[PDB]
Structure 1
Amino acid sequence: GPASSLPQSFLLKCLEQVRKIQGDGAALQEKLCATYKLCHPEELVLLGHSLGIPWAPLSSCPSQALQLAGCLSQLHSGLFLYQGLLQALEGISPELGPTLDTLQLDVADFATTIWQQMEELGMAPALQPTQGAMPAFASAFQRRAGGVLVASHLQSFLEVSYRVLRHLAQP
């Protein structure tokens, strides 16, 4: 039957949080392009390795339906990571502090939300995600570029997540 280890109300709220955050990052990316003509993340590609911008994988999602402890676990680690990267940007600058703060609270709660659900259903690993290695962002420019990059990665991460979740919503 259309059984699933995850409630549907929860999955729909996750999909809504994904869209909300996707709209927050878009605002951030718009601001950075308007305020600092930093508009194409591709141009900044190489600074990801240089700055150490972590990547959050989702290897465990297109291959499971009634057994998904690993999938939620990754979704969480990822959101948790970007929650840290956005914090590391120390607000980027006064002009961007507000826009970025919205993005970071929204990402933090989505991550929290996912954790508490995992606990409720009995999935929460004893091991809390050892917060990923956080980047430096030593100058104004590093923070501005870092922002464009982090936003770009968050974006890619959420597009995949959206597909994974959209799928689970109809089992």
Structure 2
Amino acid sequence: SQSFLLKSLEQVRKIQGDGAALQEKLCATYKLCHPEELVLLGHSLGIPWAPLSSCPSQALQLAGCLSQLHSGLFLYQGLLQALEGISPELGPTLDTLQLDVADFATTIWQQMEELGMAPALQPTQGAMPAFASAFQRRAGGVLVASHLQSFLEVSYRVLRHLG
């Protein structure tokens, strides 16, 4: 679907912009300007990063890819929620990002429905983090936004397979 391709690319764009805005605010407000410094901490906190291994350029498996996209979007929604708005000043930026993620997820779900592909549960990646300190919420923001940008760069691939 060309119309679906157009709509999904503009939604992915919108998330990527919102994510970059959240990273900019975190950098301006708390001087957390370097997502790479926070990586090993994220690992120690057990932050689950959604996989997209059924989505590669060649040997893309369409039902599997869509299932990983559906599950992964929910994972990112879960992690955003777990931030509890990070702070009163970041709340509005986080809300826009969640809304735009929701919107894209609904588009994906509508296309799964059109194709008759029910989504598969993915292997577990362990418990959601609680992010139970200010710093964790702030750093978790930087890390989740950064990772979502990369999850979305891969999502480009499948979009053109939806007819």
Q: TM-score, normalised by structure 2?
A: 0.88
Segment of structure 1 superposing worse, 125-134 or 55-64: 125-134
**RMSD, matched Cα:** 2.5
Unaligned stretches of 5+ in structure 1? 1-7
Identical aligned residues as a percent = 99
SS at match of 1:103: helix
Equivalences for residues 20-99 of structure 1 within 5 A: 20-62=14-56, 68-99=62-93
Is contact 1:28-1:99 (8 Å) kept?
yes
**How far off its partner does 1:67 sit?**
5.7
**How far off its partner does 1:121 sit?**
1.8
SS at match of 1:45: helix
Aligned counterparts of 1:133 and 1:157: Cα–Cα separation in 2: 20
Larger Rg: 1
Aligned counterparts of 1:128 and 1:149: Cα–Cα separation in 2: 22
Aligned counterparts of 1:102 and 1:55: Cα–Cα separation in 2: 21
SS at match of 2:154: helix
Question: Which residue is 1:4 aligned to?
Answer: none
1:167 aligns with 2:130: no
Is contact 1:115-1:124 (8 Å) kept?
no
**How far off its partner does 1:111 sit?**
1.2
**How far off its partner does 1:56 sit?**
1.0
Q: 1:57 to 1:147 in 2, by over 3 A?
A: same
Q: Deviations over 1:92-140 (max 9, x none)?
A: 0000000000001111221122112201221123769989731110110
Q: Deviations over 1:48-82 (max 9, x none)?
A: 11221111111112266896111111112111110
Q: 1:144 to 1:126 in 2, by over 3 A?
A: closer
Instruction: Say how many residue pairs are matched.
Output: 161
Unaligned stretches of 5+ in structure 2? none
